[PDB]
Design a protein around this motif. Structure first.
Motif, PDB file in Angstrom:
ATOM      1  N   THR A 143       0.822  -1.211   0.000  1.00 29.50           N
ATOM      2  CA  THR A 143       0.000   0.000   0.000  1.00 29.50           C
ATOM      3  C   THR A 143       0.865   1.273   0.000  1.00 29.50           C
ATOM      4  O   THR A 143       1.809   1.392   0.776  1.00 29.50           O
ATOM      5  CB  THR A 143      -0.913   0.047   1.243  1.00 29.50           C
ATOM      6  N   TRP A 144       0.549   2.228  -0.861  1.00 33.17           N
ATOM      7  CA  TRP A 144       1.258   3.508  -0.837  1.00 33.17           C
ATOM      8  C   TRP A 144       0.447   4.623  -0.145  1.00 33.17           C
ATOM      9  O   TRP A 144      -0.770   4.704  -0.303  1.00 33.17           O
ATOM     10  CB  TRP A 144       1.677   3.917  -2.246  1.00 33.17           C
ATOM     11  N   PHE A 180       1.186   1.647  -8.862  1.00 35.82           N
ATOM     12  CA  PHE A 180       0.716   1.794  -7.494  1.00 35.82           C
ATOM     13  C   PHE A 180      -0.752   1.405  -7.416  1.00 35.82           C
ATOM     14  O   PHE A 180      -1.611   2.261  -7.222  1.00 35.82           O
ATOM     15  CB  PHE A 180       0.881   3.236  -7.026  1.00 35.82           C
ATOM     16  N   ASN A 183      -3.340   2.500  -3.125  1.00 39.72           N
ATOM     17  CA  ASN A 183      -2.849   3.734  -2.499  1.00 39.72           C
ATOM     18  C   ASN A 183      -3.912   4.631  -1.840  1.00 39.72           C
ATOM     19  O   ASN A 183      -5.074   4.658  -2.250  1.00 39.72           O
ATOM     20  CB  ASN A 183      -1.981   4.541  -3.484  1.00 39.72           C
ATOM     21  N   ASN A 247      -7.256   4.640  -3.928  1.00 42.74           N
ATOM     22  CA  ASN A 247      -6.928   5.191  -5.246  1.00 42.74           C
ATOM     23  C   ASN A 247      -7.574   6.538  -5.599  1.00 42.74           C
ATOM     24  O   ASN A 247      -7.507   6.980  -6.749  1.00 42.74           O
ATOM     25  CB  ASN A 247      -7.217   4.172  -6.348  1.00 42.74           C
TER      26      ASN A 247
END
Ligand SMILES: [Mg+2]
Ligand SMILES: [Mn+2]
Length: 252
Positions: A143-144, A180, A183, A247
């Motif tokens: 996870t970002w 990614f 996120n 996202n």
């Protein structure tokens, strides 16, 4: 030291350590530092999101990244004992490169050493290549986490793709979701959801989060981002971040 500084001389060593940790600590928090904003996109646009994308795209393309901070955590917010945060210091030349004089002064007062960036600064090309192979990107296990993250992620896409950023925003987002896939934009959560306008440190303060390191530096800021996220996740979401917010990018 809780912040491990990274230059061209120890880049390889430092990435290896992060690749060794990423499986145990798959929440990656990030912040960036660039030479401010130096120009505005002229004309009239398809929308306000489209004005924002072109402002960002114009700025990212022409201005060099100066620092990137990555702070690792596990799914409940524990940092590795090895490092609270990493701070990658990239290559930058004061007379040769483009920038807002004010941003430079701010950075200098902030503790930056533009001499050392010109010397042993890291090449974004090399770092990006290591990042692609790290297991940090292109993996939904990871996870970002970021605050106002068009810029953070644009600078990344820039270095990983090695080509100019997409013309239309809807492409920028398609690619973003490739590297990614999982996120959280904290700005989008605090603002678009909890209706909180405050900026990072103000939010940090209302929550009484102790800042480790100097303000306006990527390492310390990425750390603060991590801690903010987890405080928020428990205080207001009772341990589980509503995934309708996965996202979601603020202002796009
Ligand atoms: Mg910052
Ligand atoms: Mn930021």
């Amino acid at each position: 030291s809780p912040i491990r500084d990274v230059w061209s001389t120890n880049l390889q060593q430092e990435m290896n350590l992060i690749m060794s940790l990423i499986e145990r600590y798959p929440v990656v928090s990030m912040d960036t530092e660039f030479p401010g904003v130096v120009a505005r996109p002229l004309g009239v646009f398809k929308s306000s999101d489209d004005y924002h994308y072109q402002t960002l795209r114009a700025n990212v393309d022409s201005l060099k990244i100066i620092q990137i901070g990555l702070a690792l955590s596990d799914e409940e917010g524990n940092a590795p004992v090895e490092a609270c945060t990493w701070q990658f210091n990239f290559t930058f030349n004061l007379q040769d490169d483009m920038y807002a004089p004010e941003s430079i002064e701010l950075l200098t007062k902030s503790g930056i050493d533009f001499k050392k960036h010109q010397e042993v600064g890291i090449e974004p090309a090399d770092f990006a290549e290591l990042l692609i192979g790290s297991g940090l990107v292109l993996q939904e296990e990871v996870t970002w986490i970021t605050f106002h993250s068009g810029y953070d992620f644009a600078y990344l896409l820039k270095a990983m793709t090695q080509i100019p950023l997409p013309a239309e925003y809807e492409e920028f987002y398609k690619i973003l979701c490739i590297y990614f896939p999982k996120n959280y934009d904290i700005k989008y959560i605090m603002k678009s959801v909890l209706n909180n306008s405050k900026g990072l440190q103000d939010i940090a303060d209302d929550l009484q989060i102790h800042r480790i390191g100097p303000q306006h530096q990527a390492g310390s800021d990425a750390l603060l981002t991590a801690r903010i996220f987890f405080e928020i996740r428990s205080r207001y979401f009772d341990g589980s971040i509503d995934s309708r917010m996965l996202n979601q990018l603020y202002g796009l």
